[PDB]
Each structure stands twice: as structure tokens, then as C-alpha cells.
């Protein structure tokens with residue numbers, strides 16, 4: 161399958177390290193029923209967590225991960241909740257006292273975030289602030305946030321919100337609360353992504369819609385990205401921004417052609433539809449030549465400076481009432497070049 | 500198909516009546532990407548709405564209905580939003596000024612709402628209040644809420660929340676703001692329902708899990724239920740509680756057996772697993788012998804009395820802070836017999 165062909169197959173997956181990190185912990189996963197969150201849930205069970213708290217605002221997604229894990233039902237708790245509800249979220253953290261939060265809840269579709277910039281800011285930045293503030297206040301030991309290559313020199317609302325989330329969480333890290341952020345590229349077959357779209361086009365006898373003949377992305381299997389995230393979390397001392405080695409770039413045109421070849425539907429045309437607002441032809445390569453090595457060849461540590469939280473909290477207040485979100489974001493992230 | 504075998508096939512579907520109701524209207528659908536909401540969106544387009552505003556808090560679900568309707572993209576707006584966000588929801592209504600709201604956003608899984616009663620109250624009752632209040636304040640002409648057979652003599656948190664939503668929305672109806680509620684039973688193949696669960700069990704060569712050998716539900720295809728909801732909306736003068744004729748009940752054991760015979764998978768066992776907290780063996784029959792007829796043999800009008808909104812608003816304020824939600828809901832819905 162195409163997934164098989166584009167897998168990273170990292171040489172440096174380390175089950176025993178992850179097991180050491182997770183064994184007998186109470187772990188809360190935000191966005192637990194999502195593509196990444198569901199895999200984080202599954203790996204938390206595999207690697208020996210004592211109790212998994214699954215937080216998701218999407219009832220079907222929560223239903224589904226809870227059902228998927230039914231054999232482990234005594235060790236999991238489905239919490240049907242938005243992380244924007246600070247009071248209820250605080251009650252959850254007090255009741256279950258997680259030692260580790262794995263934060264995988266966000267809105268991620270670049271076009272939808274361009275069309276709904278306020279909701280992107282609220283869900284991504286304010287949601288991350290609420291969850292982090294609650295985690296730190298309730299003495300959660302370690303907080304790992306999932307991030308994206310789109311956060312680097314961002315050209316879209318989504319990527320810029322994720323950069324703000326990095327700045328916020330990393331600036332919260334201290335001697336008691338250890339924060340790691342982990343950046344990676346596209347996950348093969350994730351919700352609402354290009355592979356399922358092309359599968360659906362082929363099955364409906366529709367031409368494949370390709371944005372641009374030269375567009376490329378970096379890809380990893382969800383199980384690879386997630387285990388590497390957990391390895392990074394395990395080694396984190398707090399305040400690290402990690403980046404994953406995604407291997408070679410994949411041209412989307414080659415992906416489309418391979419999918420057509422694999423389903424013997426070279427009858428179908430590939431139609432070029434054009435780059436969208438804020439969409440990059442080539443996302444930024446994740447690992448910089450000066451990033452620090454770790455013991456895992458797939459994981460590097462990128463440079464980051466804390467920002468003052470008083471300043472950042474004031475700017476986050478501004479994002480919620482300002483006229484021009486794009487302009488407000490640029491004040492926080494001066495490298496933001498919107499579309 | 501099992502779907503085909505259990506379809507109602509109502510004799511009284513009326514495309515031209517629905518077209519007359521929807522042609523050239525600006526319509527907003529809450530829960531637009533859900534099972535029912537997505538079909539509402541599709542039928543809004545089919546029957547000639549001018550502009551469809553699709554509101555959903557689930558990004559994948561919103562992405563998907565928006566993609567499904569790509570051929571009509573110039574007539575649709577994807578709004579990524581929770582209906583709990585009053586300020587942003589008010590901005591949407593002020594901007595687009597819909598003439599009709601079709602309210603299909605709720606949490607519906609009985610076990611999840613038993614486990615998360617506060618979130619059920621907030622999402623279902625408070626969300627409905629916020630949307631209905633915003634709709635009336637913004638001079639929306641007509642408001643149609645989707646309801647359930649589980650709202651009749653409810654035995655679970657979900658059913659009770661939906662009964663409170665009926666009471667609230669119907670009590671808001673006036674000469675200028677016409678509300679209709681439409682009760683119906685199970686939609687075949689809906690998200691997270693029995694048919695997909697049995698399909699997944701059979702695909703994984705697992706025994707089908709049947710809750711009780713005598714359990715029954717009433718079923719309809721989504722297209723039939725939705726068109727009847729729209730026919731009900733079309734004839735409503737405000738204040739009506741409508742009920743659909745679902746036909747004969749279906750024993751779930753017979754459904755399981757038929758799926759096995761159709762999949763040619765009689766090698767698999769049906770295992771009895773037990774009733775769940777608050778789960779009925781037989782839902783209440785929807786049509787009372789004294790319900791009024793309409794021109795559609797599938798649609799009846801049930802009796803309902805308005806309640807005082809000052810009292811119901813106070814009780815809703817209390818539900819948000821109280822410690823015993825079951826007890827509190829009983830004070831609003833005296834017929835609630837929890838579990």
C-alpha cells in the first residue's frame with residue numbers, strides 16, 4: 161500500500177524506554193479520539209500506563225477510541241469535554257491527578273482555519289493556554305505538546321497558532337512543570353488528509369485533484385510519529401523543542417500517480433486545482449544543521465528562547481478582542497508571513 | 500442491504516412541499532457535519548436553499564460535509580464553532596441573518612452522557628438555550644429542533660436533556676419566532692450505532708455483541724427521517740411538538756441475525772452482554788392515540804404545554820452548578836425515572 165511505501169521505518173524506536181516513561185502513570189490525552197490522540201492512547205496502554213484519561217469534545221471520536229480499547233476498559237476513562245471549559249477541566253485534573261499530559265487537541269485544517277481565524281485562535285491558543293495553566297496549577301509533572309512543521313516561518317493562521325502554542329507552553333516550563341514540544345510533518349492517512357481524499361476520488365471514478373505539480377510534503381506513519389513523540393517526552397528535561405527526522409520529501413504528484421497505479425485506475429485524470437491561501441509548496445525542513453543531537457537519530461533539539469509570560473498573556477488577551485487577527489498574530493510571531 | 504430491509508419507505512414524502520419551504524432561504528444547520536445534520540445540509544441544497552451556513556465544532560465532520568457539497572461551494576459557508584460560544588454565534592447570526600435554523604447539534608450516546616452528565620447538560624441544554632436565544636434575538640423566523648423517542652418518560656441523562664430542550668425551545672415560540680420540535684427514533688447506520696458496530700465485528704471475525712435477546716428499536720433511513728422533519732417544519736405554525744411514525748419495531752437479535760445471513764457469516768456467534776445503565780428494552784411508542792393527524796400520514800402532532808421561562812431559566816442556571824444533576828433534572832422533568 162502507499163502507506164507502506166512512504167513509512168519512515170525509523171531504526172531508533174525504543175519500546176523499553178517508552179515503557180519506563182509511562183509505566184504505572186496516570187496519563188491524560190487531550191484530543192484522545194483524533195488521529196494522533198487515538199494512537200497516543202493505544203501506546204499509553206501498550207507501554208504500561210495505569211490509567212488513561214481520554215479528553216475529547218467530539219462524541220463520535222471519543223466513543224470510537226473508548227470502544228477500540230474495550231479490552232482495557234478498566235484502565236480508561238472517557239471524558240467528553242472541550243478543553244476550553246476551564247472549570248470542568250480543572251475538576252477532571254483534580255479528580256484523576258495525571259502525571260503526564262499529552263496534548264493532541266487542535267484544529268488543523270489550513271483552509272478552515274483561514275476561513276475561521278477566530279475559532280482557530282480560540283481552540284488552538286486559548287485551549288492550549290487553559291489546558292497548560294490547569295496542568296501547571298494542578299502539579300502535573302510533564303506536559304508534551306504536539307506541533308507541526310507548519311509552525312516554522314508560518315504562512316497560515318493554523319501554523320501561526322501552533323507557533324504561539326509552542327511559545328506559550330515552553331515559556332511555562334520550570335523546575336516543577338516540564339514541557340516538551342515535538343514538531344513533525346504530515347501523518348500518512350490522518351483524518352481529512354490527502355490519502356483518504358484520493359481514495360474516495362478513485363472509488364467514485366473522479367479525477368484526482370492535485371493542488372500543484374511541484375508540491376511536496378514530509379510523511380510518517382502515525383505509530384512512528386507517536387512513538388518518537390513519546391521517546392522525546394521520556395528524555396525531556398523541560399523546555400525542549402524537539403524536531404523529528406521525517407526522511408525524504410514526497411512529491412504529491414508521485415503519491416497520486418502511485419495510488420492510481422496501485423488501484424489500476426490509470427483511466428483517471430489528475431487535475432491541477434491550484435495552491436490555496438496560505439499553502440506552502442515545500443514545508444520547511446525540520447532539522448537545522450545546528451540543532452542538538454539526542455541519543456535517538458530520529459530526534460533533535462531545536463533552539464528556543466522563552467518569552468515573558470506577562471507579555472504573552474497580554475497579547476493572547478488582545479487576540480480575543482482585536483479587529484485583525486492576522487495583524488495581532490504578527491505581533492507575537494514576527495516571522496509570520498501570511499499568505 | 501440490512502438498511503434496505505429496515506427502511507420505512509414512507510408513502511408520504513413530498514419534495515415539492517419541501518422545495519416551497521426552503522427555496523431561496525438562508526438556512527443555518529447546527530451540527531452540520533453529523534449524521535442528521537449532514538443529511539439536512541444535503542436536502543437544503545437539493546430543495547433550493549440560497550445559502551447554507553454549516554455550524555459544527557468537529558473539524559473533520561465540518562471538513563467532510565463541506566467537501567461532500569463541493570459542487571455547491573458558492574452557496575455554502577463552513578463555520579467551525581461550538582454553539583456554546585454565544586459571542587461568536589451571535590456574530591454569525593448577525594452577519595448571515597438566517598431565516599431558518601435546523602438544530603441537529605447534541606451529544607447523543609446514552610452511556611457517554613451517563614458517564615459525563617455535566618457535559619451532556621452543558622452541550623445539550625445550554626447549547627440549545629444559547630442557540631435558540633440567539634436565533635430569537637436575531638429575528639430568525641423559524642427554529643426546528645431534532646428530538647428523540649428517548650425524551651418520552653426518560654430513564655437516562657441523554658433523554659432527559661433532550662426533554663428539557665423541548666420544553667425550552669417550545670416555551671420560546673411566539674408570533675414572530677416559530678419553533679417546531681420533531682421526535683423520531685433510531686436512524687439506521689448513524690454515527691457510532693449498532694449497524695456499524697456489527698459490521699466492524701463481522702469484518703474482524705468477532706462475535707456480535709447483543710445487549711439483550713428481547714431488545715427492540717424503531718428505525719428509519721436518514722433521508723426519510725430528514726425529509727419528514729423538513730415536511731414537519733414546513734407545516735409548523737409554531738409551538739408544535741411533532742412525532743414521526745417509525746412503523747414496526749425491529750428486534751435487535753433479528754437485525755444481528757440478518758446481518759450475518761447477508762454477510763454470509765453464519766460462522767459467528769451472537770453473544771449476550773447485558774443492558775446498560777438507563778437503557779430501555781423498548782422505547783416508548785411515539786404516536787399517542789390522541790395525537791392530532793396532519794396531511795402526512797407519517798407525521799402527528801403531540802400535546803405540549805409551555806412552561807414559565809423565568810422558572811426554567813433559573814433551573815437551567817442551577818443545572819450548571821449543582822452537584823446532583825440527576826436529582827435536579829427530575830425537578831424539571833417530573834416523569835424522569837433515572838435507571
Ligand SMILES: NC(=O)c1ccc[n+]([C@@H]2O[C@H](COP(=O)([O-])OP(=O)(O)OC[C@H]3O[C@@H](n4cnc5c(N)ncnc54)[C@H](O)[C@@H]3O)[C@@H](O)[C@H]2O)c1
Nearest residue numbers: 191193194195196216217218242243265266346347350351
Ligand atoms: N495529522 C497531521 O498530519 C499532523 C502532523 C503534525 C502535527 N499535527 C498536530 O497533531 C494534533 C492532532 O492532529 P490530528 O491529525 O490527530 O487531528 P484530529 O482532528 O484527527 O484530532 C484532534 C482531536 O482533538 C479533538 N479536539 C479538537 N479541539 C478540541 C477541544 N477544544 N477540546 C477537546 N478535544 C478537541 C478533536 O475532536 C479530535 O478528536 C493537532 O495538534 C495537530 O495540530 C498533526
Ligand SMILES: NC(=O)c1ccc[n+]([C@@H]2O[C@H](COP(=O)([O-])OP(=O)(O)OC[C@H]3O[C@@H](n4cnc5c(N)ncnc54)[C@H](O)[C@@H]3O)[C@@H](O)[C@H]2O)c1
Nearest residue numbers: 530532533534535555556557581582604605685686689690
Ligand atoms: N442518530 C439517531 O438515531 C437519532 C435519532 C433521533 C434523534 N437524534 C438526534 O439527532 C441529532 C444528531 O444526532 P446524530 O446521529 O446526527 O449525531 P452526530 O454526533 O453524528 O451529529 C451531531 C453533530 O453535532 C455536532 N455538535 C455537537 N455538539 C456541538 C456544539 N456544541 N457545537 C457545534 N456542533 C456540535 C457534532 O460534532 C456532530 O457533527 C441529535 O440532536 C440527536 O440527539 C438522533
Ligand SMILES: O=c1ccn([C@@H]2O[C@H](COP(=O)(O)OP(=O)(O)O)[C@@H](O)[C@H]2O)c(=O)[nH]1
Nearest residue numbers: 270346353354357369370371375376377412
Ligand atoms: O485534494 C487534495 C488535498 C491535498 N493536496 C495536497 O496534498 C498535501 C497534503 O495535504 P493534506 O490536506 O493531507 O495535509 P496538509 O499538508 O495541508 O496538513 C498538500 O500538499 C496538499 O496541497 C492535494 O494535492 N489535493
Ligand SMILES: O=c1ccn([C@@H]2O[C@H](COP(=O)(O)OP(=O)(O)O)[C@@H](O)[C@H]2O)c(=O)[nH]1
Nearest residue numbers: 609692693696708709710711714715716751
Ligand atoms: O453493541 C451493541 C450496540 C447496541 N446494541 C443495541 O442496539 C440498539 C441500538 O443501539 P444504538 O447504540 O445504535 O442506538 P441507541 O438506541 O442507544 O440510540 C439498542 O437496543 C442497543 O442495546 C447492541 O445490541 N449491541
Ligand code: NA
Nearest residue numbers: 174175176177
Ligand atoms: Na530498548
Ligand code: NA
Nearest residue numbers: 195198224228
Ligand atoms: Na483508527
Ligand code: NA
Nearest residue numbers: 233234236237
Ligand atoms: Na472505562
Ligand code: NA
Nearest residue numbers: 513514515516
Ligand atoms: Na408534492
Ligand code: NA
Nearest residue numbers: 534537563567
Ligand atoms: Na456520509
Ligand code: NA
Nearest residue numbers: 572573575576
Ligand atoms: Na463555500
